[PDB]
Design an enzyme around this catalytic site. Structure first.
Site, PDB file in Angstrom:
ATOM      1  N   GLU A 145       0.858  -1.164   0.000  1.00 36.47           N
ATOM      2  CA  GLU A 145       0.000   0.000   0.000  1.00 36.47           C
ATOM      3  C   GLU A 145       0.902   1.225   0.000  1.00 36.47           C
ATOM      4  O   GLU A 145       1.904   1.268   0.717  1.00 36.47           O
ATOM      5  CB  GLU A 145      -0.953  -0.060   1.204  1.00 36.47           C
ATOM      6  CG  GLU A 145      -1.667   1.210   1.542  1.00 36.47           C
ATOM      7  CD  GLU A 145      -2.398   1.810   0.367  1.00 36.47           C
ATOM      8  OE1 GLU A 145      -3.123   1.078  -0.356  1.00 36.47           O
ATOM      9  OE2 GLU A 145      -2.243   3.035   0.166  1.00 36.47           O
ATOM     10  N   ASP A 169      -7.212  -4.648  -6.981  1.00 38.02           N
ATOM     11  CA  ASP A 169      -8.390  -3.837  -7.270  1.00 38.02           C
ATOM     12  C   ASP A 169      -7.844  -2.496  -7.743  1.00 38.02           C
ATOM     13  O   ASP A 169      -7.693  -1.556  -6.951  1.00 38.02           O
ATOM     14  CB  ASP A 169      -9.341  -3.740  -6.072  1.00 38.02           C
ATOM     15  CG  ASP A 169      -8.722  -3.062  -4.853  1.00 38.02           C
ATOM     16  OD1 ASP A 169      -7.556  -3.344  -4.510  1.00 38.02           O
ATOM     17  OD2 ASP A 169      -9.421  -2.222  -4.247  1.00 38.02           O
ATOM     18  N   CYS A 202     -13.142  -1.646 -11.405  1.00 34.57           N
ATOM     19  CA  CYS A 202     -14.221  -0.671 -11.392  1.00 34.57           C
ATOM     20  C   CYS A 202     -14.362   0.007 -12.748  1.00 34.57           C
ATOM     21  O   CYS A 202     -15.072   1.012 -12.864  1.00 34.57           O
ATOM     22  CB  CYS A 202     -13.992   0.355 -10.271  1.00 34.57           C
ATOM     23  SG  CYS A 202     -12.386   1.210 -10.289  1.00 34.57           S
TER      24      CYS A 202
END
Length: 453
Positions: A333, A381, A408
């Site tokens: 991250e 993602d 998405c």
């Protein structure tokens, strides 16, 4: 050649991704609000460009049997529910079709099964977080949502796709701001105090965080305001202040302050507790985010000996959801405080096989591989823009056999799929998920695998 305010009878022949009806007249492609395929309308021309135009329904001649008549128009014009005028079964079919067409037109793929979109059983009232601007409208402090493509606040009390208790808190806060004479923000003037309210309420926990987003630190008699709002909503555990003193479209500024209680709520997802700070990213549709992650879990066929990379791990929701199913979770991250939160969330749930680095994904993968880690599944993602070629090649260089791509944006997914295919991965299955029901949003899980190719 058409002019604005012309009225022409058109048949709607298509529907855009974002939910505009499509008509084709005199060589132009017209986009029409609140108009569905096979409807026949008198269309009012609003604007004519070179190849496209914009229209409005002056009168419905033939209304679609798939039209939802009960939707308040406010939800279309605010863009809160771009597909809310379409029956929910046809919303799902449309999102399925879009995935299929993207795979064919972009990746040249026509022989892979695309499942029908996973829908929500009661696809309303679902968001666990409100972000509402506070503006003076008609002389009175109002809460609501901006009209599409504008910063003009539509006053709303019922947000349709939001937790009704959140709606009630937003209204109670609106009225308290009025009783206490606190001024709303004015973007043009850069005047006033209250810019936004952010209210998070645990989907399962009911715990409420109120964030007052203000231009300045001092809020007069805010302690008495807090005293009264917690009387009405004893489930409030946190009243936060975010100071944004900048002329920007960004909601939050840099400085946060705790005015009451905690600086987080706790809520649950797939059986785990998550501590959720004011600015943390946390899926607003808990019910469907659970199904989305469950789908990726199912596609990846997770085994207790799998070594998972949770690429772009955030506050940890995906990797911590699978941690009980696999041997090790390695999260990368970029934001250090998100890694702090994901480490806290692992500890809160007594999860000990989830390890996080703050680095680029490529560098983390390089160092993990140098450390002897042998990834077998990558869960990623990506943002709307998809993955970089560097990331794709780096993820492929890890040797990981299965990649669960949670998209998405179907368009960038299909592009990325092409490179993974060139690199020896096969696209095995595809499942669209209605993560944001009543909206245009298409979420997709794609399974890429270099097994059995």
């Amino acid at each position: 050649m058409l002019k604005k305010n012309d009225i022409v009878e058109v048949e709607i022949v298509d529907l855009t991704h974002e939910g505009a009806g499509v008509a084709k007249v005199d060589g132009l492609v017209f986009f029409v609000e609140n108009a569905l395929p096979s409807e026949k309308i008198l269309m009012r021309v609003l604007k004519v460009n070179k190849k496209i135009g914009f229209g409005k329904v002056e009168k419905y001649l033939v209304q679609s049997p798939h039209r939802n008549q009960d939707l308040d128009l406010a939800y279309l014009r605010s863009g809160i529910a771009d597909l809310g005028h379409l029956s929910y079964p046809e919303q799902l079919k449309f999102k399925t079709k879009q995935v299929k067409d993207s795979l064919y037109k972009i990746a040249g793929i026509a022989d892979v099964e695309v499942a029908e979109t996973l829908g929500m059983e009661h696809p309303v009232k679902y968001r666990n977080k409100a972000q509402v601007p506070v503006r003076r409208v008609n002389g009175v402090l109002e809460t609501g949502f901006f009209r599409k493509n504008s910063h003009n606040l539509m006053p709303l009390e019922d947000f349709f796709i939001q937790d009704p208790v959140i709606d009630q808190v937003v209204v109670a806060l609106r009225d308290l701001l009025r009783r206490f004479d606190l001024k709303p923000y004015d973007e043009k003037e850069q005047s006033g105090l209250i810019r936004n309210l952010v209210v998070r309420r645990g989907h399962y926990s009911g715990q409420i965080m109120v964030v007052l987003v203000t231009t300045r630190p001092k809020v007069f008699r805010v302690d008495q305001l807090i005293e009264q709002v917690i009387k009405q909503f004893p489930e409030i555990v946190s009243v936060m202040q975010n100071i944004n003193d900048q002329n920007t479209n960004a909601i939050f500024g840099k400085e946060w302050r705790t005015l009451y209680g905690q600086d987080y709520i706790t809520d649950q997802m797939l059986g785990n507790d998550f501590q959720i700070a004011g600015p943390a990213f946390y899926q607003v549709n808990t019910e469907m985010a659970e199904k989305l992650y469950q789908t990726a879990i199912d596609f990846a066929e997770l085994k207790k000996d799998d070594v998972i990379i949770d690429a772009y791990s955030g506050i940890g929701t995906i990797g911590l959801s699978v941690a009980k199913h696999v041997k090790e979770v390695y999260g990368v991250e970029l934001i250090p405080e998100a890694v702090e939160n994901s480490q806290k969330n692992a500890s809160l749930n007594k999860i000990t096989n989830a390890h996080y680095v703050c680095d680029t994904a490529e560098n983390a993968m390089k160092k993990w591989l140098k450390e002897g880690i042998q990834p077998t599944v990558i869960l990623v993602d990506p943002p709307r823009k998809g993955l970089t070629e560097s990331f794709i090649k780096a993820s492929a260089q890890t040797g990981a056999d299965r990649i669960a791509y949670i998209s998405c944006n179907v368009a960038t997914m299909a592009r990325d799929i092409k490179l993974y295919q060139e690199l020896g991965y096969e696209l095995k299955k595809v499942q669209p998920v209605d993560l944001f029901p009543q909206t245009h949003h298409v979420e997709t899980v794609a399974l890429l695998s270099k097994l059995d190719v």
